[PDB]
Write a protein that binds this ligand. Structure first.
Ligand SMILES: *[C@@H]1O[C@H](CO)[C@@H](O)[C@H](O)[C@H]1NC(C)=O
Lengths: 34, 49
């Protein structure tokens, strides 16, 4: 009938980007790749 | 000025920014306050040195 998902969080560093209105529209996960 | 306990000096001017309901202050790349919401008129002001 329905479905749901479950994922855990870890302490990491992220680089966010705010657009002209102040909304977050992109991000980068430092130390996820080289 | 003294906006909800925050003191400083500058020139206040009307702004065109739209704060979300849970936000009160705005900062720049230098970590300094440039915008504020008046706690009575609920309008947004710009701070300039
Ligand atoms: C974001 O700001 C621009 C101008 O800076 C405006 O044209 C646009 O409508 C704004 N976005 C929203 C969702 O209001």
């Amino acid at each position: 009938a329905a479905a749901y998902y479950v994922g855990y969080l870890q302490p990491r560093t992220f680089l966010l980007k705010y657009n002209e209105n102040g909304t977050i529209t992109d991000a980068v996960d430092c130390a996820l790749d080289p | 000025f003294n906006f909800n306990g925050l003191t400083g000096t500058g020139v206040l001017t009307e702004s065109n920014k739209k704060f979300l309901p849970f936000q009160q202050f705005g900062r720049d790349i230098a970590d300094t306050t440039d915008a504020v919401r008046d706690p009575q008129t609920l309008e947004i002001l710009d701070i300039t040195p």
